[PDB]
Design a protein around this ligand. Structure first.
Ligand code: HEM
Length: 91
C-alpha cells in the first residue's frame, strides 16, 4: 500500500475523524467502531474499501457525510487509512 497515501489518510483522520473515532473506536455509538470485527458486523458492505468510502462519502445516522466537505483525494486517503488500520489490526 502507498506509504504517502496512508500518511495522507492519517492526517485527514486526525483533522476530521478522531473527534468521534479516537483510537479507532466510536465515542458517539460505542459498538460501531473502526475495528475489523465491528466493521464486518455493522458496516453495510462489510470490511471493504468501497464500503468504507461509501459511508465516509454519504454518511449514516450521526456519522456525517463528507463528500461535500473533503476533496476526493482526502476521502480516498482517509478511507485507505481506515481500511489499513482495520484490516491489519493497527488501531
Ligand atoms: C472522518 C472523515 C471519519 C471517518 C473516516 C469515519 C469513518 C466511519 C466508518 C468507516 C464507520 C462505520 C463503522 C462501523 O462499525 O459501522 C463510521 C461510523 C460512524 N461514525 Fe464515523 N467517520 C468519520 C467521522 C466521524 C465523526 C466526526 C463523527 C462524530 C460526529 C462520526 C460518527 C460516527 C458514528 C455515530 C458512526 C455510526 C453510524 C451508524 O451506523 O449509526 N464519524 N465512521
Amino acid at each position: 500500500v502507498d506509504a504517502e497515501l496512508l500518511a495522507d489518510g492519517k492526517k485527514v483522520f486526525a483533522g476530521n475523524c478522531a473527534a468521534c473515532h479516537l483510537g479507532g473506536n466510536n465515542s458517539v455509538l460505542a459498538d460501531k467502531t473502526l475495528k475489523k470485527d465491528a466493521i464486518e458486523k455493522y458496516l453495510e458492505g462489510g470490511l471493504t474499501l468501497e464500503a468504507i468510502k461509501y459511508q465516509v462519502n454519504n454518511g449514516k445516522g450521526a456519522m456525517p457525510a463528507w463528500a461535500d466537505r473533503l476533496d476526493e483525494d482526502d476521502i480516498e486517503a482517509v478511507s485507505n487509512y481506515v481500511y489499513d488500520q482495520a484490516v491489519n489490526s493497527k488501531w
